[PDB]
Write a protein that binds this ligand. Structure first.
Ligand SMILES: Cc1cc2nc3c(=O)[nH]c(=O)nc-3n(C[C@H](O)[C@H](O)[C@H](O)COP(=O)(O)O)c2cc1C
Lengths: 353, 94, 70, 829
């Protein structure tokens, strides 16, 4: 009962129930679509007009559903059709992926140990920073050598050069975290008097605020159920109706060009295949609009970090705020009619040629 | 087998095992492996005046099971009667 | 080191109009040398440096010709 | 939907019927409870009066339609056993139950490559129809609308696995007791769940019919009494016991003097009225403790009487014996956690999953007619919810570790109420932890209390061998513990009576010399015991002792406690005393596996399997050390030419594996011809022990020193060059030579015999015969050993199987074994 929670902030469920995917996926989609609608209306555009002003669209994991829905919109009188399509896809993904791998209680000793060692509350996804994929895969391989096939972990998101997320059962990721804790150096440790080659690796790790192991082998059995539900509910995406290229999260290719079912591919990308953000974002552009959730701690800022120095500007389209370094934009930038609306980031090769 | 026959054979094997013990080598590597990996023993309690076998078990853990214990989240405990009396008796300090 | 570069950036920020010549050198240089690699600190701090137009980036510690400096 | 709940009309010209309807039934058809009333206009003040006759029958018929799927019949004996329908546990039912009660453990969730288990609470859904049918019979008459559930409990049967999806379960119920108390009638029911013919777990439930009952002819009781322990000191006690007609020994001539007796009885009484029994029957086995602390039966208790005011047997046992309590409390309770829980807004889902379709939990009108505070929550839901809390916190979310759980329903609880559960570890019982809990509602009123029995983590016991003794070993425990005191005093008394010394004196004072005096008859007897010792391999140990010896003197340099014959018994006694103290504290897990390093095997086999009594244990340990002493040739100075060396291969060379050490030792004992071998494999590539002539250890120590100092068929030939070089460089020294060290080789102090070596292979079979005289045939229990004991010889769990029997041959040959293996088929049949 979303409207009741919105009008009455006290009848709203607790945070953990809101974070479960059968709730989370549809509501994140709704948030993205609401931001898109606000952006279009404040600019006087129909959704088709705003889409036409775009050169392309894409999404990080779940956002791929919203991106395709946006690419199909034409007029305000038919926007709810694509809204229904996207929300239905997200609803069925959430329901079937929660039925495939529901969460269960964690032994309190594990939570106590994680909290004592300044680690997050364990969850089905662990983000690792400052390590390369090669390195993280070696650790994952050694951890998987002991676990059985159904408790394996794997690299789910390649968010950057030294930014990776590993998905799997919360306890397998806790064991991986123990192994990593036995391979890290304290942040305080000064190594200024140690030759560079001999210095120990300082790298971060934390559990993400999520409630399902996405892009993992655990959710595969939900794929057929989701595809049957989408068919029974008459939800499909036709390449002739997508008017801007939508980039696949696994290989960065145009989904329109793909021959099979686009919805099946999107579901496969969300639940099974890993996400390579850089391969997907290898497109050329001067500006990137982030309608996602999370404000300045979301997808837009990560992409900015990955594309710094290449003259690409990122605007967080879902938040109004002032950035001190002004290295990325906020909601005000999209509607500013003066020159401050158009801000370009530095391309070093050209600026210091 | 009938219980009496089983007892007879068990006694024969036991008395034989003991007679031949002071002549054969003490296979402690295999014993430690058996009760650290095939049993996943969570508590090792050492009965004796000094922590000898407990230290041996700790060294065995630090050399063959660092990865296995972490991967399976096995948090083993090694207790010697001479020093870890509180943990054995569950008599925590006030 | 990184901290030294941050302090140089702060100096350049306090005086945005004065030219500041940032002379970066790795531990590979002759004379008194540090323990730092010659490239990772630059890969880390190049963006921060370039956000200040009054800082001039000079690279040293191991050059001898136009071919290896190009 | 809007449905009829109460219909009121005139059934007859004078009879007012108030039919109360329940719409949440087991087949969807409403069930009505017709309540009848008389209308008497002549009594204007109170025209209406209830028809009390058949009222309870009507209430029970309604409850039978709601709970029991069988033809309505109240005419069956409460004394009979109730048989329930076979129940097949499926994944859907486990899912529904766990979601209804809020259990989030992962054991009960479908997961790949794992079988799904059912929670212990599922026993009630499996056996509810059998358990609740116990309070229906006509003889146990009461108003089911005033029924109160007082308590419920589960008890896993030892050695049984937990319930699991796919299992077919049969249930059986019997009424333990039904007693008319002044304020109502209590009915005690015991349900038994069986799987594949074997029983799995037992369910106990106490039910209360509130009201006034005086039909004592229908009541009976059955109580299992506490175990009573009696120590028979004098002939006066024997005379007192024999005067009792109920004290019946199987062997009338049994010698009870200086024996400990335990009485395990059960009392079955029937009541003539509130205070007087119409019949009393007390019966059970009498057993005597054996020297291995084992109890065997020697007689029975039986007592029968008519009208009586009490039980004389238990009165006598209480007055003259001691009570044995399996529960032992920790020094102080250990707080586990305080948790918060909530009752659901509706009782319908739990009712529908458990089958308990009682209208007071779902119907407003029925609850109001019952004078209840509202539509109360099932007490069983609260029990399941608190047990889920305990399982997660007290057992660390390991289902199987919960073996017992009981709850007392103290006060009622209403829907949408916040509960507050405090869990704590208070004691132990047979290796399991005792968990108390208490649940308070928002007004701080206790509504639920109970106990849980949680297994400890998988445990192993390892017993240290020789080399760690010290003056005062185990003496503090001897000061404090009674079990330790009993162990040492039995050993000391035996040593004093047999060999004329006290082991406790040696442990406490560590004398340098000890003389035994043979004056008098006792002395002569001790001299005989000394003379009878032999080292068939038939040399006599103590060759100087003869029929003219008046005394003998054990000698040493630093202390006799560091002498083998006295060292081994002291260590064995200290370890056994420690383990017996642990046992007296309810601290030993029943499935614990054990092993012993060298002399440790004996302490371990005595501590965990009670294969031999204390007096037998110390004799074998004393003889074992005595044979070792006279197993090597010693000069007049007691300095032999054999020793032991501790080696650390990883210290001589980082790439020197144990197969590399095994190479050097075998080659150093091959090209030189002297006796040397690895006796202990302690830590892989970090700790090894070699035994042999003290001379041949110096060459090994030197050879490794050459390997460490330098970077080291050709390989075999090259090593032969090294062995020869060091071989002569130490042979020159006198026979009682000195072993020094390498960077990684450190000899042991005080060791002169190469035990755990092929040297002592001749004097083995005679030692086997000696053990057979001391470890008796009947004292071995295979359940105590099978799968738990790990021998140093064959480092595999003790299994009585043809593969194990074949295995012992491979290491060391044995004539009896090949007979067993060859005739293994004869023994099987
Ligand atoms: C012989 C010699 C003397 C130097 N003296 C100084 C000095 O007095 N002060 C200083 O700041 N750097 C000094 N340096 C460092 C260099 O000026 C410069 O920072 C850098 O190390 C040159 O790197 P290269 O030797 O690889 O070309 C000296 C270097 C050399 C080889």
């Amino acid at each position: 009962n979303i409207l009741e929670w919105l009008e009455n902030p006290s009848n709203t469920p607790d945070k953990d129930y809101l974070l479960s995917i059968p709730i989370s996926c549809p509501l994140i989609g709704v948030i993205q679509l609401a931001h898109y609608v606000v952006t279009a209306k404040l600019l006087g555009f129909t959704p088709g007009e705003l889409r036409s002003y775009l050169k392309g669209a894409t999404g990080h994991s779940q956002g791929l559903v919203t991106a395709v829905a946006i690419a199909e919109t034409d007029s305000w009188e038919s926007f709810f059709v694509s809204v229904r399509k996207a929300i239905t896809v997200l609803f069925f993904i959430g329901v079937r992926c929660y039925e495939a791998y529901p969460n269960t209680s964690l032994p309190p000793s594990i939570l106590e140990d994680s909290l004592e060692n300044n680690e997050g509350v364990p969850s089905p996804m662990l983000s690792i920073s400052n390590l390369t994929q090669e390195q993280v895969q070696d650790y994952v391989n050694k951890t998987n050598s002991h676990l059985p096939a159904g408790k394996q972990v794997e690299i789910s998101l390649v968010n950057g050069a030294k930014n990776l997320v590993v998905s799997g059962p919360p306890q397998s990721l806790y064991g991986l975290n123990l192994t990593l804790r036995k391979a890290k150096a304290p942040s305080g440790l000064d190594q200024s008097r140690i030759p560079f080659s001999e210095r120990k690796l300082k790298f971060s790790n934390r559990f993400l605020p999520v409630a399902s192991p996405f892009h993992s082998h655990l959710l595969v059995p939900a794929s057929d159920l989701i595809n049957k539900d989408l068919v029974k509910n008459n939800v499909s995406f036709n390449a002739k109706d997508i008017q801007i290229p939508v980039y696949d999260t696994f290989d960065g290719s145009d989904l329109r060009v793909l021959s099979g079912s686009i919805s099946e591919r999107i579901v496969d990308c969300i639940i099974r295949l890993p996400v390579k953000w850089e391969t997907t974002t290898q497109f050329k552009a001067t500006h990137i609009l982030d309608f996602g959730p999370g404000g300045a701690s979301g997808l837009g800022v990560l992409t900015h970090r990955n594309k710094d120095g290449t003259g690409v500007r990122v605007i967080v389209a879902g938040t109004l705020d002032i950035n001190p370094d002004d290295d990325y934009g906020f909601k005000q930038e999209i509607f500013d009619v003066t020159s401050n609306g158009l801000k370009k980031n530095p391309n070093w090769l050209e600026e210091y040629h | 087998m009938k219980p009496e026959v089983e007892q007879e054979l068990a006694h024969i094997l036991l008395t034989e095992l003991l007679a031949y013990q002071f002549a054969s080598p003490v296979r402690w590597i295999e014993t430690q492996d058996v009760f650290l990996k095939d049993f996943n023993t969570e508590r090792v309690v050492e009965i004796g005046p000094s922590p000898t076998l407990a230290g041996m078990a700790q060294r065995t853990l630090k050399n063959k099971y660092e990865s296995y214990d972490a991967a399976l989240s096995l948090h083993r405990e090694i207790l010697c009667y001479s020093k870890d009396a509180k943990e054995i008796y569950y008599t925590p300090d006030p | 080191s990184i901290d030294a570069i941050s302090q140089v950036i702060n100096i350049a920020k306090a005086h945005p109009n004065f030219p500041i010549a940032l002379q970066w050198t790795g531990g590979r240089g002759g004379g008194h040398h540090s323990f730092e690699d010659a490239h990772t600190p630059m890969l880390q701090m190049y963006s921060k440096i370039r956000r200040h137009p009054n800082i001039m980036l000079i690279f040293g510690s191991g050059f001898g010709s136009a071919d290896d400096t190009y | 939907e809007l449905k009829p709940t109460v219909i009121l009309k005139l059934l007859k010209e004078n009879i007012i019927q108030m039919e109360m309807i329940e719409n949440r039934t087991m087949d969807g058809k409403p069930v009505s409870l017709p309540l009848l009333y008389n209308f008497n206009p002549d009594n204007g003040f109170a025209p209406i009066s209830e028809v009390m006759e058949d009222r309870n029958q009507r209430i029970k018929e309604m409850y039978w339609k709601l709970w029991i799927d069988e033809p309505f019949n109240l005419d069956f004996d409460p004394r009979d056993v109730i048989k329930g329908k076979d129940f097949e546990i499926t994944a859907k039912e486990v899912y529904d139950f766990t979601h209804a009660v809020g259990n989030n453990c992962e054991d009960f969730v479908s997961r790949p490559d794992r079988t799904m288990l059912a929670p212990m609470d599922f026993a009630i859904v499996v056996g509810w129809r059998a358990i609740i049918k116990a309070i229906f019979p006509n003889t146990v008459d009461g108003d089911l609308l005033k029924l109160v559930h007082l308590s419920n409990g589960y008890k896993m049967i030892p050695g049984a696995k937990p319930l699991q999806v796919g299992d077919v379960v049969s249930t059986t119920a019997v009424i333990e007791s039904v007693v008319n108390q002044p304020t109502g009638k209590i009915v005690d029911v015991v349900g038994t769940l069986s799987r594949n013919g074997k029983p799995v777990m037992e369910v106990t439930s106490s039910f209360f019919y509130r009201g006034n009952y005086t039909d004592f002819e229908n009541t009976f009781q059955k109580t299992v009494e506490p175990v009573y322990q009696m120590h028979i000191k004098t002939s006066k006690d024997i005379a007192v016991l024999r005067s009792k007609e109920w004290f019946q020994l199987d062997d009338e001539d049994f010698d009870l003097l200086n024996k400990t007796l335990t009485f395990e009885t059960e009392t079955e009484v029937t009541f003539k009225n509130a205070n007087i029994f119409s019949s009393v029957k007390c019966f059970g086995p009498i057993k005597v403790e054996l020297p291995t602390k084992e109890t065997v039966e020697i007689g029975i208790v039986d007592y029968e009487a008519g009208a009586s005011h009490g039980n004389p047997v238990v009165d006598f046992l209480k007055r003259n014996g001691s009570t044995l309590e399996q529960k032992v409390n920790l020094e102080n309770p250990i707080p586990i956690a305080v948790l918060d829980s909530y009752t659901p807004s509706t009782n319908e889902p739990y009712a529908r999953v458990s089958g308990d379709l009682n209208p007071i939990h779902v119907s407003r009108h029925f609850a109001s007619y019952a004078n209840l505070p509202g539509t109360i929550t099932h007490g069983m839901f609260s029990s399941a919810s608190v047990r889920a809390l305990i399982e997660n916190w007290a057992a660390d979310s390991v289902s199987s570790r919960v073996r017992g759980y009981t709850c007392q329903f103290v006060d009622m609880v209403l829907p949408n109420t916040a509960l507050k559960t405090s869990i704590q570890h208070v004691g132990m019982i047979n290796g399991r932890k005792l968990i108390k809990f208490e649940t308070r509602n928002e007004d701080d009123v206790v509504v639920l209390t109970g106990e849980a029995e949680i297994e400890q983590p998988v445990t192993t016991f390892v017993f240290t061998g020789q080399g760690s003794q010290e003056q005062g070993m185990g003496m503090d425990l001897y000061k404090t513990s009674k079990a330790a005191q009993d162990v040492w005093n039995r050993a000391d008394n035996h040593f004093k009576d047999t060999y004329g010394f006290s082991i406790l004196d040696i442990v406490i004072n560590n004398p340098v010399n000890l003389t035994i005096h043979f004056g008098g008859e006792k002395g002569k007897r001790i001299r005989e015991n000394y003379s009878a010792m032999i080292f068939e391999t038939t040399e006599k140990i103590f060759k100087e002792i003869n029929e003219h010896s008046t005394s003998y003197t054990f000698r040493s340099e630093k202390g006799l406690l560091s002498a083998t014959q006295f060292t081994q018994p002291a260590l064995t006694l200290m370890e056994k005393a420690a383990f017996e103290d642990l046992k007296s504290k309810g601290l030993i897990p029943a499935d614990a596996t054990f092993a012993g390093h060298s002399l440790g095997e004996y302490a371990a086999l005595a501590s965990l399997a009670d294969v031999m009594s204390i007096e037998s244990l110390v004799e074998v340990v004393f003889y074992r050390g005595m044979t070792m002493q006279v197993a090597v040739p010693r000069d007049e100075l007691g300095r032999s030419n054999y020793g032991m060396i501790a080696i650390n291969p990883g210290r001589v060379a980082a790439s020197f594996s144990q197969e590399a050490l095994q190479y050097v030792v075998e080659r150093v004992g091959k090209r030189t011809g002297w006796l040397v071998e690895i006796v202990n494999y302690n830590v892989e590539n970090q700790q090894y022990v070699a035994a042999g002539d003290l001379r041949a250890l110096d060459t090994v120590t030197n050879v490794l020193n050459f390997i460490k100092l330098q970077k080291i068929e050709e390989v075999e030939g090259h090593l032969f060059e090294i062995i020869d070089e060091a071989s002569k460089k130490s042979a020159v020294k006198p026979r009682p030579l000195k072993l020094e060290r390498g960077f990684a080789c450190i000899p042991l102090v005080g060791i002169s015999v190469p035990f755990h070596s092929t040297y002592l292979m001749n004097g083995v079979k005679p030692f086997k015969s000696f053990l057979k005289k001391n470890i008796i045939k009947e004292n071995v229990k295979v359940a105590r050993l099978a799968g738990k004991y790990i021998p140093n010889l064959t480092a595999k769990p003790f299994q009585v199987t043809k593969e194990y029997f074949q295995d012992v041959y491979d290491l060391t040959g044995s004539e009896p074994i090949k007979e067993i293996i060859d005739n293994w088929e004869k023994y099987e049949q």
